Amino acid sequence: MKRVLVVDDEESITSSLSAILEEEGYHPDTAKTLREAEKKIKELFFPVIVLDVWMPDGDGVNFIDFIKENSPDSVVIVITGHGSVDTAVKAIKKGAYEFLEKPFSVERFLLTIKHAFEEYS
């Protein structure tokens, strides 16, 4: 009964994520943008949402609301390895679960995930 959502503008799955979720035994769904995610989030009650910020063209801060708009009980970790610390604060202080300080492996994201589902058993 574990399912998480991954949003990123590069490759199908997020590097280091697949192997991870595969070790934990979750049901992760990866998107390709904010439009692709919104759709997947406009129907699928994704418990945990993880947005990336590779090199898209649809912003992200403004999206943090959409997630809480139709998913106030879900989670929003939002992790990436390309941007700036000023991006974290520009999302975590809007309804997220704090920027995961451990990109290119999302190993720490793994530990947080558990707690992320705590809000939805």
User: What CATH number does the domain containing 19 carry?
Assistant: 3.40.50.2300
DSSP-derived 3-state class of residue 51: strand
The answer to whether residues 29 and 119 touch, using CB atoms and an 8 Å cutoff, is no
Cross-strand bridge partners of residue 16? none
Experimentally, the structure was elucidated by NMR
> To 10 degrees, what angle do helices 34-41 and 63-70 make?
10
Q: Considering just the CA atoms, what is the radius of gyration of the chain in Å? A: 13
Please give the single-letter amino acid code of residue 95: G
Q: Give the neighbor-by-neighbor strand order of the sheet with 75-76.
A: 29-30, 4-7, 48-51, 75-76
Residues near 50 by beta carbon (within 8 Å), at least 6 away in sequence: 4, 5, 6, 7, 14, 76, 77, 78, 79, 106, 109
In degrees and rounded to multiples of 5, residue 7 shows phi and psi of -120, 125
Token pair for 18: 């697949």
Quick one: which of 63, 91, 71 has its CA closest to 79? 91
Contact (Cβ atoms closer than 8 angstroms) between residue 70 and residue 49: no
| Rounded CA separation 53/51 (Å) | 7
Domain count for the chain, please give it. 1
Q: Which long-range contacts (CB under 8 A, 24 or more apart) does 85-92 make?
A: 87/53, 87/60, 87/61, 90/61, 91/51, 91/60, 91/61, 91/64
Domain that holds residue 36: 1-121
